[PDB]
Amino acid sequence: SGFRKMAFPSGKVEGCMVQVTCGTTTLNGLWLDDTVYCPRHVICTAEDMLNPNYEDLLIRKSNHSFLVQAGNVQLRVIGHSMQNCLLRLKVDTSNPKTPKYKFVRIQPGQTFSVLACYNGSPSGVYQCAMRPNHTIKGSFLNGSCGSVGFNIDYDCVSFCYMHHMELPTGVHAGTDLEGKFYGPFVDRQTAQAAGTDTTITLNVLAWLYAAVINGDRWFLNRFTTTLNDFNLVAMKYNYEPLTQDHVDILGPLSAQTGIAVLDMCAALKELLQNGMNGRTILGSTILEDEFTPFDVVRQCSGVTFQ
Amino acid sequence: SGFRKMAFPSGKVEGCMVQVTCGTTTLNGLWLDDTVYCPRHVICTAEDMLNPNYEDLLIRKSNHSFLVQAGNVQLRVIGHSMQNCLLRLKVDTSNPKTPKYKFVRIQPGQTFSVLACYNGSPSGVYQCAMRPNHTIKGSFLNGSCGSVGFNIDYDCVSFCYMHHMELPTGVHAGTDLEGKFYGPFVDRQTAQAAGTDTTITLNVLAWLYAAVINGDRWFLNRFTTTLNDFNLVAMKYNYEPLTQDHVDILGPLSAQTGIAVLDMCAALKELLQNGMNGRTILGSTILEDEFTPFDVVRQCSGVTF
C-alpha cells in the first residue's frame, strides 16, 4: 500500500558521471564505454553565449582543450566531435561501470528520473514528468548542466534527457542524448520563454486509478460521459485534450478496478467542477499529473483492495 | 531553480541488496562485509506470523536452510543468529561493494531515503519521514520486507531503517539495523495500529526557510510570537508542539536568513489561521513537512557525495 513519487535506483547512472572542463567552464558529462557526452556550451566563454557559432568555436579547440575527470583522475581525450547540441569526447580508456543502455527520445507527458550532479558528483535523485510544453520543473543549481534523465527497464538504462539550461520562469530545458532539444529552445542567451502548458490528463486519470487500487473511491459517481463531453469541460480547466488512444492506454487499469475509463472521466469532470471540498486523494489536495499509467501499474499492487 | 523533494543517490545501497530465501519465504537482505541482515520473520509462513516463537523456530533451522542470492550468485551461509527482530547471516564472501557505513537510530520527524526492493532487486527510491507516530508513509508491496532506509554523509552511509510490516491504515513499520522496532509495534499478528499522527512543525518551519532562501517570502511579516502562544495555535491545527530544542536546531537557517525562529513562527501562525489565499510557496498549495533543516541546507547548498 501507499503511493510515492519514486525515482529509479540511480546507481547504474552514478557510475557514468564525470566532470568536463574547457577554459574556465566546468559541467557534468556522461561516460559510456570510451565516450563522454556533455552540453556543447562547455566551450563557450561569457560573451560567446550571447550569439555563439559552435562550429566556429569548436574548430578552434583540440583534444587537449578538454579536461575530463572521473573523480580526481584525468581521462585523456583522444578525439572529439559535435552532434547537434552535444559534444562527444572519445577518451583513452573505457568505463567498466557502463550499464546496458540505449538512447531514447521521450514524448511530453512521460516521466523519468533525474540524477542531479555537480562537478561530476551526484547530489540527489528525483522523479519528474516532461511537461506538455517540453520543459521540466526540476531542481537544478548553477553547474548542474550535463546531469541526465533516465528510466530503467530490468537492467537496461534508457537515457532520455541531458540538462542544458534554466528558463525565466525557473523551469528547465534540455536535449535527448542525440543532442536535440525538447521544445523550441536553443543553447544561447536570448528572450526564450516556456510556452503555454497544460495538465497531463492521461496521468491524472492514471493517478485516480491508483487511488482506487489502494482502496479509496470517494470521488467516484454514478455518471458516465462522452469523450467529447469530457473534453469540453476538461479543456476549460487547461487540461490536455484526451484522445481514444489515451482511453485505450487506461484499459489495463480499468480492467483491474472494474471502473470504465469514461466513468472515471465522469469522476474527474465532477472533481474539476466541484473541487475536492477539503478532502484528499492519496494524501494530496490537488490532482497530480506526474504519474503515467505505466508508473501506476509498476508501483501499485496487481490486486485492488476492494 | 526549483525545489524538489529528492532522495540520496542510491548506488551505495543498491550494491548491498541481496535476496534471502527460507523455504517458501523470500525477502530482501542487506549485505555488508561478510554479514547479511534481514527480518527474522523470514523463517516464518502465513500461519507462522499469527503467534511466532522465533526462538524455537530458529532452532529448527541450520545454515543450509537459508539461500542467499546476490545477483546471479549464491552466497554460502556459514553462520546465523538472531539480534532482536533481525537475522544475522554470516556468508563466506565479504561484499566487495561494502561502502563506509554506520547504523543509526533515527528520531521522529527525521527523514531518510528508502530503496524499495523485491527479490533482492532494487525497484525504486523515494524520500520519506519517520512520522511523529513512529510509522512511515511508504510505498511497499508484498516481498518488500528487508528494504532499507538510509542517509548519506559525504561518503558514509548511515542505515536507519529496515522494513518489516504494513499496518491496517496502509502505513508502514520497521526496525533500526539493530533489529529494534520504531514505535511499539511487533513483528507478529496483533490488533496493533498506528496512533494519531501530527504535522512535523520543525520540518514545516525548515521548509519555510527554504522558501525564503529561494526568494519566496510573501508570507513573512513584521511581528513575532512567544513559544507558548505559537504552540497554543499550532496544536489547534494538529501540529507537533515546538520545543526550545527545535528552535535551536533551526539556528543555522535562522542565521542564514536573518529571520528569528519565533518571527518565522508568527508567519506560520498567520498561514494556519488565514490560509494562503490562493498563493503558493515553492509552488505548493500546502505546507510541506517532510524536509528537515538538514535536507534544506543540503539542497540549497550544492552538497554532493
UniProtKB/Swiss-Prot annotation, chain B:
Location(s) in or outside the cell: Host cytoplasm; Host Golgi apparatus
Indicate the residues that form the catalytic site. 41, 145
Q: What is the effect of changing residue 248 to E?
A: In strain: Isolate BJ04
Listed result of changing residue 189 to P: In strain: Isolate BJ02
* Cytoplasmic-side positions: 1-305
Q: Which reaction does it catalyse?
A: TSAVLQ-|-SGFRK-NH2 and SGVTFQ-|-GKFKK the two peptides corresponding to the two self-cleavage sites of the SARS 3C-like proteinase are the two most reactive peptide substrates. The enzyme exhibits a strong preference for substrates containing Gln at P1 position and Leu at P2 position
Q: Where is the Peptidase C30 domain?
A: 1-305
What does the UniProt function comment say about this protein?
Answer: Cleaves the C-terminus of replicase polyprotein at 11 sites. Recognizes substrates containing the core sequence [ILMVF]-Q-|-[SGACN]. May cleave human NLRP1 in lung epithelial cells, thereby activating the NLRP1 inflammasome pathway. Also able to bind an ADP-ribose-1''-phosphate (ADRP). May cleave host ATP6V1G1 thereby modifying host vacuoles intracellular pH.
Q: How does it assemble?
A: Monomer. Homodimer. Only the homodimer shows catalytic activity.
Q: Tell me what this protein is called.
A: 3C-like proteinase nsp5
Give the species.
Severe acute respiratory syndrome coronavirus
